[PDB]
Design an enzyme around this catalytic site. Structure first.
Site, mmCIF file in Angstrom:
data_model
loop_
_atom_site.group_PDB
_atom_site.id
_atom_site.type_symbol
_atom_site.label_atom_id
_atom_site.label_comp_id
_atom_site.label_asym_id
_atom_site.label_seq_id
_atom_site.Cartn_x
_atom_site.Cartn_y
_atom_site.Cartn_z
ATOM 1 N N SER A 109 -3.885 7.034 4.147
ATOM 2 C CA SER A 109 -2.538 7.394 4.282
ATOM 3 C C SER A 109 -2.091 8.738 3.454
ATOM 4 O O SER A 109 -1.087 9.057 3.368
ATOM 5 C CB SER A 109 -1.403 6.210 3.521
ATOM 6 O OG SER A 109 -1.832 6.174 2.187
ATOM 7 N N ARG A 133 7.000 9.873 -6.010
ATOM 8 C CA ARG A 133 8.402 9.171 -6.096
ATOM 9 C C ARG A 133 8.118 7.680 -5.297
ATOM 10 O O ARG A 133 8.482 6.761 -5.723
ATOM 11 C CB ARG A 133 9.143 10.038 -4.869
ATOM 12 C CG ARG A 133 10.296 9.328 -4.624
ATOM 13 C CD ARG A 133 11.319 10.314 -3.698
ATOM 14 N NE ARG A 133 12.802 9.741 -3.372
ATOM 15 C CZ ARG A 133 13.492 10.432 -2.598
ATOM 16 N NH1 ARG A 133 13.428 11.600 -2.420
ATOM 17 N NH2 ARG A 133 14.671 9.862 -2.464
ATOM 18 N N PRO A 149 4.280 -2.538 4.540
ATOM 19 C CA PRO A 149 4.484 -0.952 4.300
ATOM 20 C C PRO A 149 5.701 -0.323 3.617
ATOM 21 O O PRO A 149 5.620 0.812 3.167
ATOM 22 C CB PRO A 149 5.121 -0.701 5.666
ATOM 23 C CG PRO A 149 5.764 -1.573 5.957
ATOM 24 C CD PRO A 149 5.163 -3.242 5.632
ATOM 25 N N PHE A 172 -7.528 -4.450 10.393
ATOM 26 C CA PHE A 172 -7.707 -4.790 11.939
ATOM 27 C C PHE A 172 -7.668 -3.542 12.832
ATOM 28 O O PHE A 172 -8.297 -3.409 13.917
ATOM 29 C CB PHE A 172 -6.800 -5.854 12.374
ATOM 30 C CG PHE A 172 -5.503 -5.587 12.634
ATOM 31 C CD1 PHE A 172 -4.758 -5.300 11.430
ATOM 32 C CD2 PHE A 172 -4.743 -5.158 13.777
ATOM 33 C CE1 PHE A 172 -3.313 -4.671 11.501
ATOM 34 C CE2 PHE A 172 -3.274 -4.968 14.040
ATOM 35 C CZ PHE A 172 -3.051 -4.390 12.698
ATOM 36 N N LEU A 173 -7.146 -2.339 12.350
ATOM 37 C CA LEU A 173 -6.760 -1.264 12.996
ATOM 38 C C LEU A 173 -8.215 -0.411 12.886
ATOM 39 O O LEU A 173 -8.505 -0.186 14.007
ATOM 40 C CB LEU A 173 -5.697 -0.478 12.317
ATOM 41 C CG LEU A 173 -4.308 -1.325 12.573
ATOM 42 C CD1 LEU A 173 -3.399 -0.764 11.507
ATOM 43 C CD2 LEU A 173 -3.767 -1.310 13.940
ATOM 44 N N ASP A 188 -1.378 6.119 10.349
ATOM 45 C CA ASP A 188 -2.205 6.538 9.468
ATOM 46 C C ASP A 188 -3.325 6.748 10.425
ATOM 47 O O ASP A 188 -3.442 6.737 11.383
ATOM 48 C CB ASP A 188 -2.218 5.728 8.288
ATOM 49 C CG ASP A 188 -3.028 4.348 8.409
ATOM 50 O OD1 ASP A 188 -3.299 4.156 9.478
ATOM 51 O OD2 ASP A 188 -3.007 3.624 7.584
ATOM 52 N N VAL A 245 0.719 -1.233 0.117
ATOM 53 C CA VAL A 245 -0.059 -0.102 -0.138
ATOM 54 C C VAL A 245 0.934 1.350 -0.097
ATOM 55 O O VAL A 245 1.980 1.395 0.618
ATOM 56 C CB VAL A 245 -0.888 -0.140 1.389
ATOM 57 C CG1 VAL A 245 -1.920 1.207 1.026
ATOM 58 C CG2 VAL A 245 -1.756 -1.179 1.621
ATOM 59 N N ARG A 295 13.162 8.643 -12.205
ATOM 60 C CA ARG A 295 12.489 7.318 -11.871
ATOM 61 C C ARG A 295 11.276 7.252 -12.731
ATOM 62 O O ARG A 295 10.494 8.370 -12.902
ATOM 63 C CB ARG A 295 11.959 7.253 -10.435
ATOM 64 C CG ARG A 295 11.316 6.079 -10.161
ATOM 65 C CD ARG A 295 11.003 6.110 -8.605
ATOM 66 N NE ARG A 295 12.131 5.486 -7.785
ATOM 67 C CZ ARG A 295 12.694 6.263 -6.498
ATOM 68 N NH1 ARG A 295 11.638 6.591 -5.822
ATOM 69 N NH2 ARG A 295 13.564 5.642 -6.252
ATOM 70 N N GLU A 349 -13.779 -4.042 7.939
ATOM 71 C CA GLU A 349 -12.854 -3.219 9.183
ATOM 72 C C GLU A 349 -14.071 -2.245 9.784
ATOM 73 O O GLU A 349 -13.568 -1.384 10.630
ATOM 74 C CB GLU A 349 -11.988 -2.469 8.292
ATOM 75 C CG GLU A 349 -12.386 -1.423 7.388
ATOM 76 C CD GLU A 349 -11.453 -0.542 6.813
ATOM 77 O OE1 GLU A 349 -11.537 0.409 5.882
ATOM 78 O OE2 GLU A 349 -10.244 -0.815 7.036
HETATM 79 C C1 LIG Z 1 -4.502 0.359 8.492
HETATM 80 C C2 LIG Z 1 -4.047 1.272 7.246
HETATM 81 O O1 LIG Z 1 -4.865 1.598 6.461
HETATM 82 S S1 LIG Z 1 -2.374 0.695 6.388
HETATM 83 C C3 LIG Z 1 -2.609 1.086 4.738
HETATM 84 C C4 LIG Z 1 -2.038 2.679 4.534
HETATM 85 N N1 LIG Z 1 -0.493 2.532 4.785
HETATM 86 C C5 LIG Z 1 0.411 2.870 3.875
HETATM 87 O O2 LIG Z 1 0.051 3.226 2.670
HETATM 88 C C6 LIG Z 1 2.003 2.764 4.018
HETATM 89 C C7 LIG Z 1 2.773 3.756 3.522
HETATM 90 N N2 LIG Z 1 4.166 3.588 3.855
HETATM 91 C C8 LIG Z 1 4.966 4.890 3.933
HETATM 92 O O3 LIG Z 1 4.231 5.953 3.538
HETATM 93 C C9 LIG Z 1 6.148 4.802 4.233
HETATM 94 O O4 LIG Z 1 6.786 3.552 4.331
HETATM 95 C C10 LIG Z 1 6.533 5.380 5.652
HETATM 96 C C11 LIG Z 1 5.777 6.856 5.903
HETATM 97 C C12 LIG Z 1 5.913 4.453 6.832
HETATM 98 C C13 LIG Z 1 8.021 5.479 5.952
HETATM 99 O O5 LIG Z 1 8.493 6.195 4.813
HETATM 100 P P1 LIG Z 1 9.621 7.508 5.420
HETATM 101 O O6 LIG Z 1 9.358 7.748 6.562
HETATM 102 O O7 LIG Z 1 9.100 8.629 4.529
HETATM 103 O O8 LIG Z 1 11.153 7.124 4.589
HETATM 104 P P2 LIG Z 1 12.013 5.819 4.601
HETATM 105 O O9 LIG Z 1 13.317 6.177 4.713
HETATM 106 O O10 LIG Z 1 11.511 4.940 5.698
HETATM 107 O O11 LIG Z 1 11.299 5.323 3.077
HETATM 108 C C14 LIG Z 1 11.672 5.954 1.899
HETATM 109 C C15 LIG Z 1 12.219 5.039 0.962
HETATM 110 O O12 LIG Z 1 11.648 3.909 1.006
HETATM 111 C C16 LIG Z 1 10.380 3.888 -0.258
HETATM 112 N N3 LIG Z 1 9.153 3.603 0.364
HETATM 113 C C17 LIG Z 1 8.837 3.642 1.524
HETATM 114 N N4 LIG Z 1 7.609 3.209 1.801
HETATM 115 C C18 LIG Z 1 7.140 2.998 0.344
HETATM 116 C C19 LIG Z 1 5.955 2.389 -0.088
HETATM 117 N N5 LIG Z 1 4.730 2.097 0.611
HETATM 118 N N6 LIG Z 1 5.759 2.298 -1.499
HETATM 119 C C20 LIG Z 1 6.864 2.546 -2.119
HETATM 120 N N7 LIG Z 1 8.050 2.956 -1.838
HETATM 121 C C21 LIG Z 1 8.334 3.084 -0.454
HETATM 122 C C22 LIG Z 1 10.527 5.317 -0.770
HETATM 123 O O13 LIG Z 1 10.233 5.309 -2.044
HETATM 124 C C23 LIG Z 1 11.969 5.942 -0.252
HETATM 125 O O14 LIG Z 1 12.867 5.406 -1.201
HETATM 126 P P3 LIG Z 1 13.557 6.244 -2.547
HETATM 127 O O15 LIG Z 1 14.492 7.298 -1.952
HETATM 128 O O16 LIG Z 1 14.155 5.268 -3.546
HETATM 129 O O17 LIG Z 1 12.287 6.946 -3.152
HETATM 130 MG MG LIG Z 2 -8.545 0.831 7.370
#
Ligand SMILES: CC(=O)SCCNC(=O)CCNC(=O)[C@H](O)C(C)(C)COP(=O)(O)OP(=O)(O)OC[C@H]1O[C@@H](n2cnc3c(N)ncnc32)[C@H](O)[C@@H]1OP(=O)(O)O
Ligand SMILES: [Mg+2]
Length: 729
Positions: free
Chosen positions: A276, A126, A546, A463-464, A636, A119, A311, A437
């Site tokens: 998110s 990016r 994640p 589950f959250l 989130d 997700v 990219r 959910e």
């Molecule tokens: C209960 C629910 O609803 S869960 C569903 C919703 N949750 C999500 O979508 C999770 C999304 N995940 C994210 O946004 C990130 O993983 C975070 C915020 C948790 C952590 O990311 P950040 O703190 O910004 O920095 P971090 O150093 O850990 O990661 C950045 C690097 O990992 C990549 N990356 C991190 N998360 C993701 C992701 N979900 N998808 C694709 N690439 C990712 C980034 O592209 C970046 O790499 P790059 O320099 O090549 O572009």
């Molecule tokens: Mg949800």
């Protein structure tokens, strides 16, 4: 900050959105522009009253449950009377007879493949590009870059290549190969090279050679048969590729010249418009729609400075097949889009239809029209549409979150049907991933699936959110256990198993995914590898990760566990009963010492503040926030919903006072400030807490949490983010 709307029938559309649709989204779809906006008008006008009615029904049922608990403050628990009450008011409905779903035209990634589901927030191009490209990931990079390999005893990562650590990575991957694609009577640790002879893999050893124990696992290769550059294998429906280059840095250290092992991992990815991201107006929605457009056209590109490169989306992958010829595999993750649910409006469009005095339009209706329109491009491989496609079977995949019961599922399917009419798509093109959910969906899940029986492509235990709804629904019943104890409850264990049982009995195996939830500890990958195997062992064909790195590591679980064999063993079993689901997670009397109450309040306030400050001040809807134990957690709106509803419940029942809650917020805000001090864009909340819109938003989420509909966080977050935007401008 400058109002500028275009009239389209009863609608008044923000110019930025009007122009985006007309100039960027519509060209190439063959949809007449005037007819499209006439369709938007008609769908919004026709479906808004039922949308309003469904939300009113949520409010009415909750008020009845509130009153039921207040009438019985001294009466003992009575599961029978309680269940009979929920039935009498229409909250619990009868279960339909057994049935089988009929959804067709679905891609193999969903119907017959088990593996990770990523997700990602759609407002971050990016990350979205990285996520679409996460279908293939380096296992060496994922091991080297995480704590799956300890950094102790001289195995530090650094920023280059520490051979002490690299050798441990190689050994770990050699064991993975021995486990997943075993040789006959030999270990890959003893390989000296690879060749293709008579269409089958030959692995050279020290003084002999070996075949695969199952030669059918060989899927292809690159380079010449006598000196291949890579070997492609498959196990449990997922591909593994061994890269061979004795001239590379790593390959020159390797006994067989192996440079990397690539795993097929994020088979599907959900591009997220919901929990998110922070999107509160037309400008924000257009940013998200534009990124979704670039993914479906295939031309999304982002300059990344880390040096600077551009990219782009990966091409498909080509191989020589074992017996000759060309094998083409998809290079990109199959994309879902998660629309918002039924609750919120967004003033990107305002409606004058039928008494509405410029009322903001329901956002879920808009998402279906606009993400559905844009997804047409992902079905077409042309110059006008871009050559890269998403579905290979003609479907569009929409995750629909936060639904409450089967009438709300039926409404989503009617919305999709009406959108298909506007877009000129065959009925049934738009498929639905149903989040399980909310409590009224869990308790009526069979009926929910039946209402979408020809459109459903997954169910997933969110589950959250589900825990947030658990706390709000029973807010008046008494104080709840601490949020870290919810994982051990009767209700949550039955919720997970009943989801799987109900999906399997509805014929999901071979037709649709059964999915489970997100791993939130972004840096604890050794723990993830140890623990998250429970989800495929439970019969889930997918679960949420994640990051791409976590996707690559979680893919290993699907090589260790034969999920489809697990599902076969589960067929016909009914492992739960209704009163388990209806067991409210109330705390026992005299449950907590003062220090335990203090830790829960401070931990929840810290995680709330750390998430909300970046939401309000920077429009970031997903952040990594260390908790009171310094564990880095993905935050989130669903994790926020839990924390704020728990504190609201503790306030409601006098476990803490409002003065306690404010004091904890004031204690934790400077610690959040310190965690963010390195960020040059950060605006400290301390010392003038009441001058920080972000601090006030966190306070509202707690002190008024009991009054938020089903405990949802968007009304406050959207109001406060719009306040900051107007102020900053
Ligand atoms: C209960 C629910 O609803 S869960 C569903 C919703 N949750 C999500 O979508 C999770 C999304 N995940 C994210 O946004 C990130 O993983 C975070 C915020 C948790 C952590 O990311 P950040 O703190 O910004 O920095 P971090 O150093 O850990 O990661 C950045 C690097 O990992 C990549 N990356 C991190 N998360 C993701 C992701 N979900 N998808 C694709 N690439 C990712 C980034 O592209 C970046 O790499 P790059 O320099 O090549 O572009
Ligand atoms: Mg949800």
């Amino acid at each position: 900050h400058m109002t500028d709307r275009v009239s389209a029938g009863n609608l008044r559309v923000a110019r930025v959105l009007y122009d985006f649709v007309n100039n960027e989204a519509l060209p190439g779809t063959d949809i007449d522009q005037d007819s499209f906006w006439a369709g938007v008008d008609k769908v919004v006008t026709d479906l808004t009253p039922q949308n309003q009615d469904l939300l009113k029904t949520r409010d009415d049922l909750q008020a009845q449950i509130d009153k039921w608990h207040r009438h019985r403050v001294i009466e003992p628990l009575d599961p029978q009377a309680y269940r009979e009450f929920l039935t009498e008011i229409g909250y619990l409905l009868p279960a339909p007879e057994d049935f089988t779903i009929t959804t067709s035209g679905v891609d193999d990634e969903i119907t017959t493949t088990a593996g990770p589901q990523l997700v990602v927030p759609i407002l971050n191009a990016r990350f979205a590009l990285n996520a679409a490209n996460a279908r293939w990931g380096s296992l060496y990079d994922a091991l080297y870059g995480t704590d799956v390999i300890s950094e102790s005893d001289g195995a530090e990562k650094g920023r280059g290549y520490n051979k002490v650590r690299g050798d441990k990575v190689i050994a770990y991957a050699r064991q993975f190969l021995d486990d997943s694609v075993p040789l006959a009577g030999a270990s890959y640790t003893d390989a000296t090279g690879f060749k293709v002879e008579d269409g089958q893999l030959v692995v050279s050893l020290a003084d002999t050679s070996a075949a695969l124990a199952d030669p059918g696992q060989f899927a292809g290769y690159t380079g010449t048969a006598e000196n291949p550059k890579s070997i492609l294998l498959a196990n449990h429906g997922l591909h593994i590729e061994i890269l061979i280059d004795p001239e590379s840095q790593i390959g020159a250290t390797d006994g067989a010249g192996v440079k990397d092992v690539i795993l097929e991992s994020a088979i599907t990815t959900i591009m997220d418009f919901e929990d998110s991201v922070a999107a509160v107006d037309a400008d924000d929605k257009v940013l998200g729609y534009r990124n979704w457009l670039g993914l479906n056209r295939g031309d999304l590109s982002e300059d990344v400075t880390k040096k600077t490169f551009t990219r782009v989306l990966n091409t498909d992958r080509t191989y020589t097949a074992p017996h000759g010829g060309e094998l083409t595999l998809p290079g990109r993750s199959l994309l879902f889009v998660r629309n918002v649910g039924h609750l919120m409006t967004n003033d990107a469009i305002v409606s004058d239809a039928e008494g509405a005095e410029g009322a903001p339009v329901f956002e879920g209706i808009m998402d279906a029209l606009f993400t559905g329109l844009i997804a047409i491009h992902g079905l077409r491989s042309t110059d006008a549409n871009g050559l890269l496609t998403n579905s290979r079977t003609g479907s569009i995949y929409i995750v629909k979150p936060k639904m409450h019961g089967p009438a709300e599922v039926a409404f989503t399917c009617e919305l999709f049907s009406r959108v298909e009419d506007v877009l000129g798509l065959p009925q049934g093109t738009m498929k639905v991933g149903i989040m399980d959910e909310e409590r009224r969906t869990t308790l009526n899940l069979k009926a929910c699936i039946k209402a979408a029986a020809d459109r459903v492509v997954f169910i997933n235990t969110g589950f959250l959110d589900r825990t947030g709804d658990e706390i709000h629904t029973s807010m008046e019943a008494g104080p709840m256990i601490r949020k870290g104890a919810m994982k051990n409850t009767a209700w949550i264990k039955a919720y997970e198993d009943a989801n799987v049982d109900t999906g399997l009995a509805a014929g999901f195996s071979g037709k649709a995914q059964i999915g489970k939830g997100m791993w939130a500890m972004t840096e604890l990958m050794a723990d993830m590898v140890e623990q998250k195997i429970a989800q495929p062992k439970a019969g889930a064909t997918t679960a949420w990760v994640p990051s791409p790195t976590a996707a690559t590591l979680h893919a290993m679980h699907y090589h260790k566990v034969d999920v489809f064999a697990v599902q076969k063993e589960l067929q016909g079993k009914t492992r739960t009963s209704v009163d388990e689901l209806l067991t409210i997670p109330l705390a026992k009397e005299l449950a907590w010492a003062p220090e335990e109450i203090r830790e829960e309040v401070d931990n929840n306030c810290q995680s709330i503040l750390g998430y909300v400050v970046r939401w309000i001040d920077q429009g970031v809807g997903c952040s990594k926030v260390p908790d009171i134990h310094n564990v880095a957690l993905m935050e989130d709106r669903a994790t926020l919903r839990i924390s704020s509803q728990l504190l609201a419940n503790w306030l409601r029942h006098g476990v803490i006072t409002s003065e306690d809650a404010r004091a904890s917020l004031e204690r934790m805000a400077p610690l959040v400030d310190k965690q963010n001090a390195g960020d040059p864009e950060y605006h400290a909340m301390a010392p003038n807490f009441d001058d920080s819109i972000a601090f006030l938003a966190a306070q509202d989420l707690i002190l008024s949490g009991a009054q938020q509909p089903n405990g949802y966080t968007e009304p406050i977050l959207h109001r406060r983010r719009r306040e900051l935007k107007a102020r900053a401008g």
